[PDB]
Design a protein around this ligand. Sequence first.
Ligand SMILES: Cc1cccc(-c2cc(N)nc3[nH]cc(C#N)c23)c1
Ligand SMILES: [Cl-]
Length: 261
Amino acid sequence: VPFVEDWDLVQTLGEGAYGEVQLAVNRVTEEAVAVKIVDMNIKKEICILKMLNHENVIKFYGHRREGNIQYLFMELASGGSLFDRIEPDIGMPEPDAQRFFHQLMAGVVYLHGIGITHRDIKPHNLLLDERDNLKIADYSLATVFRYNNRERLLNKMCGTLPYVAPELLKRREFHAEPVDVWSCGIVLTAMLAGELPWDQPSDSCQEYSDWKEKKTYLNPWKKIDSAPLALLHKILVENPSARITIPDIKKDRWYNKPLKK
Ligand SMILES: Cc1cccc(-c2cc(N)nc3[nH]cc(C#N)c23)c1
Ligand SMILES: [Cl-]
């Protein structure tokens, strides 16, 4: 029964990095959107949200400040998240994963091209519209890494441990783009295996060591076809200057393989 101007807030869709997200339905027009509700940084997020115009990125409709509360209106994803399409221990059919991967690269290339890094790519932040088109959501941790054509290195630790690149734990400062590439590799592994490969990409983690020693006879790798696995070997490369860039992912064999379910 709460509402904001013309919109009713009809049900909880969940919680992003900060605040709650509600399904908002217009009393008059019946249009449904999503609204993020924040209490009591948000200037930055709004500035970034207003830049976004791409089919694989959630669009921002505008915002309203009432009291303590701030309302950020955004495109609704009626298909829910990618997380809900990944069957545990199985993943999803390779052709569906490939399609979602293409769309995730289109969104990330968009962001990077406007000098924005997302910093928390994972299946919970990758939403689906009614045609199962992927949309990258939640810009609460997003920031500028290129401005006036000059790159700025990042130094703040943020993200989600299983998805975070190893440099972010080991370096005082690091480049933004290879960190988002790495997390897209972990997404791809989740999609193809229904399991995350490691708790964190650190020296104390045995599963990460196993991967650096190429023990791909272990899970999750043994579930993945050699062709996508060859791509994962180029993405999940410890040294970020040696790691594959997006332009070269677009040249990969698996990426360009015709697939149908
Ligand atoms: C990251 C997140 C958490 C909770 C809900 C949502 C969300 C769910 C949905 N069905 N559509 C949405 N559109 C923008 C959302 C955001 N943020 C969003 C997204
Ligand atoms: Cl998973």
